Design a protein around this nucleic acid. Structure first.
Ligand SMILES: [Mg+2]
Ligand SMILES: [Zn+2]
Ligand SMILES: [Zn+2]
Ligand SMILES: [Zn+2]
Lengths: 160, 133, 158, 86, 196, 49, 141, 114, 264, 65, 559, 43
RNA sequence: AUCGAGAGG
């Protein structure tokens, strides 16, 4: 692997280094090995990095994998969008997938939740668990046909 | 309203490049040595053979719209054979007591170096160029 | 070094060189006090959060840290006088321009950023179509629907 | 619950008016202008109610307030005279 | 379209005077862009022009069959015998000015087909019209004079702009808006409401 | 120039589209997946003409 | 008379076919450089020869002129469009009562024809016109 | 369905004048004339004959849309020179050259024998 | 002769004229062929009333054929536009009515040519409405074919029109147009592979102009003044009267502008 | 389905040249190029009107009513 | 999600679209048929009643007109069948459902809506044809093509709604997009191809064309610029004429591969105060590039100036291109005889390389690379050999192309086309690939029944030596079709999966907005990011800046 | 009309791809687009 | 209105 690193002058120079690539992962066992840098080793399996190096290293591995997916084809997306997706997956304490049993099992109301997938089961369980919806969500006000608390509806307007 | 430079150059090198109507030219002044010039000419209008010799002038005049010549009595400041209008876009200090001036005649470029022009050639929109015979 | 940041300073400096016509011979009228104290007050006035509590002001200093690094790098005293040759008028105009353009660049509360983020990822993915690693849409599905059974798990060892 | 408002001092919301509250202000103003409301600017022959609302905004003669809500339930009232437009 | 996936709608119609013309007074029946050519690599179009030109001049047919030993060099050698430029290029003149086109134009006969799709069989506008029975929403399709679908993808896209009142209007005023009487005890809409 | 090959039901011309199927009475071997307990399987689709 | 056989997909596993009858001529220079690169078929023990390779294509693909000079998704894309090109579908259109019929005023046989068109009766029942086409930039419409 | 009637290329509509002349903002002696129901046949000829006049500075025509048949012609002359006079002189020069062309052609045609 | 543009006619016939336009502005030569295509008027069929059509062609097919038939329009100046006449629908001072009757009496297929057109309206003695027949056999344009039992009876009202409104009123087919066949003006940059001279064909009009001297440089201020044109007519108006009426229509079109300038 | 009156590109009348085309083909035993040259069709825009024509009217006659 | 969250809606229309170079960027071409159909309620003010009465007088049968009148009591008046359609007495407090008129805000949509820039507000320009006309430089955010695409259009019905359309969702506001922090709109095919030929140093324009080109620019000062060349023939440069479209106060600096300030071959780009100094204009200057000219004008001058700048460039370049002309023929695909001989010699030496590696692997003299089999190494070496072959032949072709070559001109302008298209058309299409590998042995130990069994040659496993110009052999044609089928399958699979991927993404992040403390939150109030994007700034107002402190020695940093 | 009569439907481990066995017995190109591509083929 | 088929991007 070619690599740029500072010379003792301070100018960046090319210091190419031998780097190992594998075909599997038990990273919990592999970093505890002499002759490697346990501060630099990296997995393409971000889920093992979340399990081993904490959840916040899982954030960086998840972002780096999405970034590599985007930049393989050559496209650019800004940091904030991918970081928003990553932090949404990472806020609940662990990796929360974007699936019907991922984000869509959360406490995020019921009418918003019934709008994605498993509509009838979600409505049934919300009727059974005696759920209450704040209707602060976008999809609740879309269903109710009201001005949602969004950009032009985040506030009231009154007189002086 | 007056002439800001006058010299006489012998062309060293002519280069068509990838162009069929424009050649880049490289000349040095034979009057005063070590003062040289690189300049983009249109050879269709004014053919510039190699190892020729020709006068080079720069004026300040002789904003408002462009009236046509319209008459023989409109006082041209030119018995010259090739005149262009340009704009200086950079002044280069190659060394102390040395200068290089950069002009663009709408894309055709000009390098002129030396230190004889030490009281003129300011950064002005007004810029002409006259070449004689 | 090239990184996406707010207000472009090359364009501001070239606009100041053209607006106030700048000569590269005559010296400036900038005391060192003006340059340094004006840059340090400009850093104070590049506002993102407005709470007077310690936590929110610390978050404000954190939120402007990269842009302040860029600003101090480009508005150094030798860089201003030796390279840009700014006058006092042009310098205060640059300060006003930077402050106003920064305050324009702040996000507007209410803007639905999540839908915009998801569409911002979905559009190039819709054009993603085609070295034996999982890339593109199957890798993106592996990432999104969390892949315990990854097709290509690897380990880059240093 | 009762009077959860933030006073006029100690307000951290942006004094710069956002494009969203600007668009809501111009829309509500052109809405009431459309239904024959009194206008508070010498109009220089303008007839489009949106241009009327925009020229009222530039001359600051719009008596409305922006109640910016906060996620705890509190809110901040900002007059149009306070809000900078850029 | 043509026989090479070169689809296209008529952007505008010009008359013979505004059309560019060669020195033989010939005008194109059709003008396509040179920008549809390289990204799709439809060389058979450009060989069809050449072979059809030489067939129209010779009066014979064009053996455009696949897997033949027909060469573009042989077709060009044929075309040069008929007085034209061997690559299908022709000096063409501007229709508005008569000044010669600075570039030379790829000109020739080419089999073009008129497709099934036409504008007036596809054009549709509704603004206000019939409604469905069960949902009280606009009916489907233009054959019933119906409404265009403001999809959930469009709902997401319009949320991204933050257009709140436009979204409420499109989801109430341009569709099944309705008033219902409800109570505070049940919270359900079983209120017998005699309005007058 | 008409070629035939179609049916006329209720004045509308109808075509029976050729269906594709795997042949019967042929012996084929399927190497099953890695988490499958059976490794290989020999299938024959038995049918009489 | 045994000059031709009926070979299906399974039986052709066991046979060797020549692509064109010039492959059976013996071997032994000056060559036109514009022709394609035809590989010398190093095999010599054939059982069959193809009639003509043009017969690998269907009815709609045999309409395409020079499809050996086009990329393959283009030949695919056209074959779904020729089923939407208007023309004389039948000569008794003024007798039938089809729910929708579209006839071209002056149909034209193409100036570039495949030899396979004659069995598809395209020159006798065409579906387009030999339009005079210029490929040029002209006011950007 | 939607296309306009084809006579609108030359037939003047309701309340449509032939020429509409308007002064130019930020131009001393310039004027812009909307020619209605015309094409490049008239505009190119008027402009090219205008540019032969020595006392005129600027003359150019433009077709704002190929849908409608109309064009705008802007003329700019010297002081003491109404551009309408330059337009009239150009038009009369056009008519004189056309008449000379027609007479010379009739002469050369009557000389011919077939 | 008279000063201004100069004409030398190379060749001429009743259907083609080939001449040289010398000392002309180029925009005049362009507007000449533009008017020669579009704006000089001609009489052709603009309404068809169909009584019986037992043919296999639709009636609008037949009407589209009939509109394209060349009718004589030599004295079209003495015929007014129907929008300009004061009649109710069409009269003798604006329109010309042809009629067409044909029956499949023969066992063999009977053709309908344009020669079978029968003029009904009173011409009032002007050379107008005769279908021009340049065929060697005297039959007109082959309009239709009929078997036994098929008939066709219709009535065509022809009116005055210009080729801007519809190309059926087109009086000329193709205008050959070439200036500077040597490209001594360098008005176009030729496309070549090895040599532009050998890969591009030499025009016949290169004979009527001097080849450029390669030792002499490019003439900067030379302009396009000599033109090589050929006008072909379908036969509605003769070839001389195509270009003469083009010149006259161009003069009249300039004169209407001159008149509107006075009226303003 | 029958001979067009005039060329689409040129405008030259071609409708009167069909029977002469077929007589020059069959009676005089000529090829198509010399027939199109004899009929005065020199531009190829005019030539593709006659050469690429399928006279389908002859089939439409065959239907009896 | 079928009736709620998505509905068929009133005041909606769709048609086939086409592109109009003489329309503005924010303008949409609306047919009169649609404009006579779609209405807007206008309340009667003192300002409008003199126009509204004339609109009602015109009736619903011509485009300036109205269809319904809503009285204050609430009973609608149908102007198509009524007695009082001539003697209406408009009183204040009533509504007139007038037609669509010019310079009206409308939503304009292209139906795969994977973008906020796929539904944008537009100013109405009413046109007499049935197609929706739009500017070429608005195609890319919609991903529109004029091969038969249909586009939707929605019409607001209240004043706040039109305000939300015009002040938030307008076309000039969405020029710089938050995604990719760059302009999504730019100059497209014809303008992009002609602006390069315009900006060449050879390109000189005489007075007659210069005057019309100047008058074509809408917002003009009326000042004819001083020409570049004066004495032998007064001539202008295309750089000199194009700069009138650029507003004064624009500064653009760009250096690339070889860029002196004398810049031979006209590389780079230098623009100062609405005038360019040197540089051929192409896609990196005037396309959708980050830090490009549209970025500069949108950021400095504003959105409206940039939107008018689009049309100002388009009119001038389209006029110059229309009077210049440009084409493309098969001669643009033909290289030299010597170049074709050298290309087939390259293919032949690659074939000999493949034969020698094949014999080396057959004699079991191959060295097994670690981690892979012998056959994997063999397949990798032969695939890399044939890819090197077709790339070297394509570069041998691209060297042989002239500057007049029109495919090369479209490549150099960045309008359309790439190097691989030239390689496949002129030199060699190359090696077909199925499921990542070469053409698999679909038959027993062979690919086609014209090959002997166990043939691992390039022709047997799907290398296509001939080009699209020369013509493919039957086997080559079948292998190419075998690859293209997988290409179309992958296209359909990519679309079908990515629609679901986008839907799941959006429905997961649909509630995420910046509240009034810069805390990126959802409906519950849970904090996703405490500061949005970790800095609290909009991605629209963000450009690539170099940081001069990072690189270089400590000594140069000290100096 | 010709291409409709010679139409093969394949209702439903890589079926949609053009198999090598398809040589001479089915059209390599003539197939629908997008949804159900390669399942429907004409011989 | 349900089911189904074909087609356009
Ligand atoms: Mg499309
Ligand atoms: Zn209750
Ligand atoms: Zn009358
Ligand atoms: Zn013709």
């Amino acid at each position: 692997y070619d690599r740029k690193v500072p010379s003792p002058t301070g100018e960046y120079v090319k210091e190419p280094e031998w780097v190992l690539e594998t075909d599997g992962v038990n990273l919990s066992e592999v970093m505890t090995v002499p002759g490697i840098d346990p501060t630099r080793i990296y997995t393409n399996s971000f889920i093992d990095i979340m399990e081993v190096l904490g959840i916040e290293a899982g954030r960086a591995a998840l972002y780096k994998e999405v970034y590599n997916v985007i930049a393989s084809d050559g496209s650019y997306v800004n940091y904030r969008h991918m970081a928003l997706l990553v932090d949404v997956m990472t806020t609940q304490g662990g990796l929360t997938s974007v699936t019907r049993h991922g984000f869509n099992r959360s406490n995020t109301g019921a009418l918003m939740r019934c709008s994605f997938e498993e509509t009838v089961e979600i409505l049934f369980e919300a009727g059974a668990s005696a759920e209450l919806d704040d209707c602060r969500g976008v999809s609740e006000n879309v269903i109710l046909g009201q001005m949602a608390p969004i950009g032009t509806g985040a506030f009231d307007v009154m007189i002086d | 309203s007056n002439t800001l430079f006058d010299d006489i150059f012998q062309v060293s090198e002519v280069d068509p490049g990838r162009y069929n109507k424009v050649c880049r030219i490289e000349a040095a002044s034979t009057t005063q040595d070590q003062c040289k010039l690189t300049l983009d000419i249109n050879v269709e209008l004014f053919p510039v053979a190699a190892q020729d010799s020709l006068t080079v002038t720069i004026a300040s005049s002789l904003t408002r719209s462009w009236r046509p010549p319209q008459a023989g009595d409109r006082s041209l400041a030119d018995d010259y054979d090739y005149v262009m209008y340009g704009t200086a876009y950079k002044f280069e200090e190659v060394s102390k007591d040395l200068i290089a001036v950069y002009y663009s005649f709408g894309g055709l470029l000009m390098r002129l170096e030396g230190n004889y022009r030490n009281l003129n050639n300011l950064k002005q929109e007004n810029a002409y160029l006259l070449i004689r015979r | 070094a090239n990184w996406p940041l707010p207000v472009n300073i090359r364009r501001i400096i070239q606009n100041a060189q053209q607006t106030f016509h700048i000569d590269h011979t005559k010296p400036s009228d900038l005391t060192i006090k003006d340059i340094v104290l004006g840059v340090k007050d400009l850093q104070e006035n590049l506002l993102v959060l407005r709470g007077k509590n310690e936590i929110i002001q610390n978050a404000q200093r954190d939120a402007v840290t990269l842009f302040c690094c860029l600003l101090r790098s480009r508005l150094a005293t030798r860089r201003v006088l030796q390279e840009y040759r700014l006058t006092k008028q042009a310098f205060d105009w640059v300060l006003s321009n930077i402050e106003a353009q920064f305050l324009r660049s702040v996000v507007h509360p209410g803007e639905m950023v999540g839908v915009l983020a998801a569409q911002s990822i979905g559009e190039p993915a819709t054009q993603m179509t085609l070295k034996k690693v999982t890339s593109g849409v199957p890798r993106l599905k592996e990432i999104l629907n969390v892949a315990k059974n990854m097709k290509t798990p690897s380990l880059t060892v240093y | 619950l009762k009077e959860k408002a933030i006073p006029k001092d100690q307000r951290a919301t942006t004094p710069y008016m956002t494009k969203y509250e600007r668009a809501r202000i111009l829309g509500t103003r052109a809405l009431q202008i459309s239904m024959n409301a009194p206008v508070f600017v010498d109009l220089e022959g303008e007839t489009d109610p949106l241009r009327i609302a925009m020229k009222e905004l530039a001359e600051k003669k719009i008596p409305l307030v922006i109640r910016r809500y906060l996620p705890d339930g509190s809110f901040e009232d900002w007059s149009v005279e306070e809000l900078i437009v850029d | 379209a043509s026989r090479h996936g070169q689809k296209g709608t008529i952007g505008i119609t010009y008359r013979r005077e505004d059309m560019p013309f060669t020195a033989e007074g010939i005008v194109p029946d059709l003008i396509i862009n040179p920008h549809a050519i390289p990204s799709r690599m439809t060389v058979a179009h450009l060989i069809e022009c050449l072979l059809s030109k030489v067939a129209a001049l010779s009066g014979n047919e064009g053996d455009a069959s696949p897997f033949t030993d027909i060469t573009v060099e042989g077709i060009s050698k044929l075309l040069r015998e008929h007085g034209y430029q061997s690559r299908g290029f022709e000096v063409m003149y501007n229709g508005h000015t008569g000044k010669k086109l600075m570039a030379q134009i790829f000109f020739g006969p080419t089999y073009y087909q008129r497709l099934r799709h036409m504008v007036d069989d596809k054009i549709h506008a509704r603004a206000r019209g019939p409604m469905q029975v069960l949902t009280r929403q606009p009916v489907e399709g233009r054959s019933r004079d119906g409404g265009l679908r403001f999809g959930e993808m469009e709902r997401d896209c319009m949320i991204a702009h933050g257009a709140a009142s436009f979204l409420k209007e499109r989801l109430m005023e341009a569709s099944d808006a309705f008033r219902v009487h409800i109570c505070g005890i049940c919270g359900l809409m079983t209120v017998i409401a005699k309005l007058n | 120039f008409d070629m035939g090959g179609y049916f006329i039901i209720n004045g509308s011309e109808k075509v029976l589209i050729a269906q594709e199927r795997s042949a019967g009475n042929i012996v084929q071997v399927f190497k099953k997946a890695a988490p499958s307990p059976i490794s290989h399987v020999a299938e024959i689709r038995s049918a009489l003409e | 008379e045994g000059l031709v056989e009926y070979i299906d997909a399974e039986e052709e596993e066991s046979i060797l076919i020549a692509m064109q009858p010039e492959d059976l001529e013996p071997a032994e220079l000056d060559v036109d450089p514009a022709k394609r690169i035809r590989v010398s078929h190093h095999a010599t023990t054939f059982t069959h020869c193809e009639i003509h390779p043009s017969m690998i294509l269907g009815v709609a693909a045999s309409i395409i002129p020079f499809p050996d000079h086009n990329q393959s998704p283009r030949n695919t894309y056209q074959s779904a469009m020729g089923k939407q090109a208007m023309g004389v579908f039948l000569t008794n259109y003024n007798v039938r009562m089809d729910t929708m019929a579209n006839i071209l005023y002056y149909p034209q046989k193409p100036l570039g024809t495949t030899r396979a068109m004659e069995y598809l009766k395209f020159r006798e029942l065409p579906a387009g016109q030999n339009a005079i086409v210029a490929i040029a930039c002209y006011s950007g419409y | 369905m939607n296309a306009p009637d084809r006579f609108e290329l030359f037939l003047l509509g309701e309340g449509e004048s032939k020429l509409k002349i308007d002064p130019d903002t930020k131009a001393p002696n310039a004027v812009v004339i909307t020619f209605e129901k015309e094409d490049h046949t008239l505009g190119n000829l008027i402009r090219a004959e205008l540019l032969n006049d020595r006392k005129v500075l600027f003359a150019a025509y433009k077709v704002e849309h190929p849908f409608f048949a109309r064009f705008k012609l802007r003329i700019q002359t010297t002081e003491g020179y109404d551009p309408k006079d330059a337009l009239k002189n150009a038009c009369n020069s056009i008519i004189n050259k056309l008449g000379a062309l027609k007479t010379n052609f009739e002469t050369e045609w009557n000389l011919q024998t077939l | 002769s008279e000063e201004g543009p100069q004409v030398k006619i190379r060749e001429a016939s009743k259907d083609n004229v080939d001449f040289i336009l010398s000392n002309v502005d180029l925009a005049m030569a362009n507007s000449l062929r533009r008017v020669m295509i579009a704006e000089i008027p001609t009489l052709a069929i603009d309404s068809v009333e169909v009584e019986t059509n037992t043919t296999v062609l639709a009636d609008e097919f037949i009407a589209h054929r009939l509109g394209l038939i060349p009718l004589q329009s030599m004295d079209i100046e003495q015929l007014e536009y129907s929008r300009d006449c004061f009649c109710e629908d069409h009269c003798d001072k604006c329109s010309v009515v042809l009629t067409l009757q044909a029956f499949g009496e023969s066992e063999s297929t009977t053709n309908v040519y344009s020669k079978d057109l029968v003029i009904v309206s009173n011409l009032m003695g002007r050379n107008i409405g005769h279908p021009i027949i340049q065929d060697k056999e005297g039959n007109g344009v082959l309009i239709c074919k009929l078997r036994k039992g098929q008939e066709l009876k219709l009535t065509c009202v022809a009116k005055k029109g210009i080729a801007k409104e519809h190309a059926k009123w087109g009086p000329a087919a193709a205008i050959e147009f070439e200036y500077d066949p040597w490209n001594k003006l360098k008005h176009t940059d030729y496309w070549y592979e090895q040599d532009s001279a050998k890969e591009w064909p030499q025009s016949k009009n290169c004979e009527y102009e001097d080849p450029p001297n390669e030792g002499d440089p490019f003439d900067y201020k030379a302009q396009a003044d000599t033109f090589y044109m050929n006008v072909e007519s379908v036969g509605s108006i003769p070839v001389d009267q195509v270009v003469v009426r083009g010149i006259d229509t161009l003069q009249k079109k300039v004169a209407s502008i001159l008149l509107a300038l006075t009226q303003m | 389905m029958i001979v067009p009156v005039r060329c689409f590109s040129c405008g030259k009348v071609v409708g009167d040249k069909w029977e002469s085309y077929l007589n020059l083909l069959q009676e005089d035993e000529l090829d198509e190029g010399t027939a199109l040259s004899r009929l005065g069709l020199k531009r190829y825009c005019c030539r593709r009107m006659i050469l690429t024509h399928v006279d389908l009217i002859e089939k439409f006659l065959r239907y009896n009513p | 999600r079928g009736n709620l969250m998505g509905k068929r809606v009133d005041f909606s229309a769709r048609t086939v679209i086409s592109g109009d170079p003489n329309l503005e960027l924010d303008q949409v071409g609306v047919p009169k048929s649609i404009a006579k159909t779609l209405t807007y309620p206008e309340v009667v003010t003192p300002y409008n009643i003199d126009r509204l009465t004339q609109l009602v007088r015109n009736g619903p049968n011509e485009h300036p007109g109205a269809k319904y009148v809503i009285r204050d009591s609430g009973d609608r008046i149908d102007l198509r069948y009524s007695k009082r359609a001539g003697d209406i007495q408009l009183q204040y407090g009533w509504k007139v459902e007038r037609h669509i008129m010019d310079n009206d805000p409308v939503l304009f949509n292209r139906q795969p809506s994977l973008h906020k820039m796929s539904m944008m507000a537009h100013r109405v320009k009413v046109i007499p044809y049935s197609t929706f006309r739009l500017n070429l430089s608005v195609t890319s955010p919609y991903n529109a093509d004029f091969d038969g695409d249909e586009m939707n259009l929605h019409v607001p019905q209240s004043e706040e709604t039109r305000a939300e359309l015009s002040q938030l969702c307008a076309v000039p506001l969405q020029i710089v997009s938050p995604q990719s922090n760059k302009p999504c709109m730019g100059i497209v095919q014809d303008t992009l191809c002609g602006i390069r030929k315009l900006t060449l140093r050879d390109t000189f324009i005489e007075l007659d064309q210069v005057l019309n080109m100047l008058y074509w620019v809408p917002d003009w000062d009326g000042v004819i610029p001083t020409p570049a060349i004066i004495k032998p023939k007064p001539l202008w440069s295309g750089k000199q004429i194009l700069s009138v479209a650029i507003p004064n106060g624009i500064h653009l600096q760009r250096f690339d591969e070889g860029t002196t300030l004398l810049s031979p071959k006209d590389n780079g780009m230098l623009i100062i105060d609405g005038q360019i100094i040197f540089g051929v204009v192409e896609k990196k200057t005037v396309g959708s590039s980050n830090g490009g000219l549209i970025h500069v004008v949108t950021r400095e001058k504003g959105p409206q100036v940039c939107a008018k700048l689009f049309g100002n460039i388009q009119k001038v370049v389209n006029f110059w291109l229309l009077h210049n002309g440009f084409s493309t023929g098969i001669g643009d695909t033909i290289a030299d005889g010597p170049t074709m001989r050298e290309i087939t010699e390259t293919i032949a030496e690659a074939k000999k390389k493949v034969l020698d590696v094949t014999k080396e692997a057959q004699a079991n003299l191959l060295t097994a690379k670690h981690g892979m089999t012998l056959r994997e190494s063999f397949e990798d070496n032969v695939v890399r050999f044939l890819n090197e072959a077709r790339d070297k032949a394509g570069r041998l072709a691209e060297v042989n192309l002239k500057d007049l070559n029109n495919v090369k001109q479209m490549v150099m302008a960045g309008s359309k086309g790439s190097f691989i298209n030239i390689a496949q058309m002129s030199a060699c299409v190359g090696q077909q690939s199925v499921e990542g590998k070469r053409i698999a042995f679909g038959f027993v130990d062979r690919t086609l029944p014209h090959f002997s069994k166990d043939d691992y040659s390039p022709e047997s496993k799907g290398f296509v030596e001939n080009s699209y110009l020369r013509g493919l052999t039957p086997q080559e044609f079948f292998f190419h079709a075998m690859g293209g089928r997988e290409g179309l399958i992958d296209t359909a699979v990519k679309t079908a999966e990515t629609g679901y991927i986008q839907r799941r993404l959006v429905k997961a992040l649909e509630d995420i907005m910046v509240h009034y403390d810069n805390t990126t939150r959802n409906s519950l109030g849970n904090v996703i990011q405490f500061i949005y994007g970790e800095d609290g700034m909009d991605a629209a107002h963000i450009e690539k800046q170099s940081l001069d402190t990072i690189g270089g020695s400590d000594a140069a940093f000290e100096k | 009309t010709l291409s409709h009569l010679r139409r093969t439907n394949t209702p439903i481990a890589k079926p949609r791809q053009l198999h090598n066995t398809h040589w001479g017995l089915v059209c390599p190109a003539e197939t629908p687009e997008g949804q159900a591509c390669g399942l429907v083929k004409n011989l």
